[PDB]
Amino acid sequence: MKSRYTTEFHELEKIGSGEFGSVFKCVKRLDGCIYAIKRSKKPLAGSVDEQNALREVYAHAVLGQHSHVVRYFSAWAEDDHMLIQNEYCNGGSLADAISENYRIMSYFKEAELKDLLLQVGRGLRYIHSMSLVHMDIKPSNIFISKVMFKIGDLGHVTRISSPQVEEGDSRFLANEVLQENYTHLPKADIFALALTVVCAAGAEPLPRNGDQWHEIRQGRLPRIPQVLSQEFTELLKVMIHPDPERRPSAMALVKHSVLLS
Amino acid sequence: MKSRYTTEFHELEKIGSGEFGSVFKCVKRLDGCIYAIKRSKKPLAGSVDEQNALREVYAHAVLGQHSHVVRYFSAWAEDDHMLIQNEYCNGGSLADAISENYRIMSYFKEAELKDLLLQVGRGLRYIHSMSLVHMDIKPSNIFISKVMFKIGDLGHVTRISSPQVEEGDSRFLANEVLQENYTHLPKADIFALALTVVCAAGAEPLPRNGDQWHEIRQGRLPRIPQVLSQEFTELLKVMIHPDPERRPSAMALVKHSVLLS
């Protein structure tokens, strides 16, 4: 026995539990720090599935310098497992923050939503300037650590001019991407961020398909149970515009007047 | 055989060569990236020397979020060696940049010196806000990667209220620290930065002891072979003031009017 995982880390609890791969909260014995470690089944080898597993590693390994992307420390292979060791974000995911807000009827306020939008948008600005796109922006892939919001789960990351794409979650998926039209991939991360912010504003759970799904993709915001400024609401709406060329880029988003404050 | 070091990395060249420990430029086989790896002799165990080796690891492991501090990825132990795997900075050290400038008679210009001073100062602002001090600020511990300047070599890092200190390089050493007076440790990193900037301005090699050494510690700048603004020169001079309470803190430095631009 005696893997690197067992020798180098103390596993504290399971925090994530999945199709491909569990995640643990662990303390590295040598440095004293807590890390989030994903232990996934090691794919067939030379396989399509292995290439997709290695893009996550390659993605994380060039996306290690940003405050709004989860930092990467190491990745390795042993047994029939692949392991990636990442920054532990101690406030958990945005999805659980939203879920708790939903039960108490107290949501993110307009100032907090602007801050979320701006932070994740700086994250995206950086990803996109590396000629990469994320492809699965959603609350369960945004982690909380001033609160700081960090983009994690780089499992769908691809290069921006990619001719093949692994489509992200349905509820956050831009229609041009469903229609296999990959001409403005970055604007699909923009579309998914707007809907991430809508969920944070206290929206009902987004639809996966059917008529409500198509109504959003026509450029119509889900109902938000709180009064937002017209300007803020306009910016969210433009972010889900049917024409992805109309959506702001991430650079135009972070320099937007609405987010100045 | 088969250490983690050998299995996980391809060693490309030796780039650093020392008393305690060689440094190699290596490619991690799994992620494709280049890292700078220090392989040092593993100290006796429970020893004073081991505690000092582990502060570097502990230091690096809380100083992993900053643009102006060399990022840390992992550290481990095998054989009779300790290894730390760090960000590879591809422009090398500030000391070699200065050394090359010295031979060609073309130094950092006032704008470049302000940028160096400001960058390293942001690095120090962060270290100091973690209630740590560096204790060995000098050109061979500043790495270059827009150029970016990054503080590395965390081997003398201590907590700010530390009653015992490992004194840094003589040529950069503030006198109160020589006199075992540890009441304003952060201001010793300030004093060492000023002299780092003077070397970058084209100064002769600094003295290790003797009368020229004491003359600097009286608050007098070494000769700089280029015309600097009075304001800039005043700020350097205040940074080496004999009274360390007169020296600016790192926060006051980065907010200084002279560095605004």
Ligand SMILES: O=CNc1ccc2[nH]c3cc(-c4ccccc4Cl)c4c(c3c2c1)C(=O)NC4=O
């Ligand atoms: O509860 C506190 N923090 C928390 C709770 C549940 C979690 N699930 C996760 C999955 C992940 C994760 C997601 C996709 C791929 C790999 C990992 Cl480690 C991470 C984290 C968490 C995480 C962090 C994290 O902190 N950094 C992460 O990279």
Ligand SMILES: O=CNc1ccc2[nH]c3cc(-c4ccccc4Cl)c4c(c3c2c1)C(=O)NC4=O
């Ligand atoms: O020549 C290009 N880059 C270069 C050249 C010589 C070098 N010596 C080094 C020592 C170190 C170093 C210094 C103290 C402790 C541990 C290390 Cl790895 C580093 C680096 C270099 C380094 C980087 C670095 O890039 N990141 C570092 O942490």
Ligand SMILES: [Cl-]
């Ligand atoms: Cl979600």
Ligand SMILES: [Cl-]
């Ligand atoms: Cl030096």
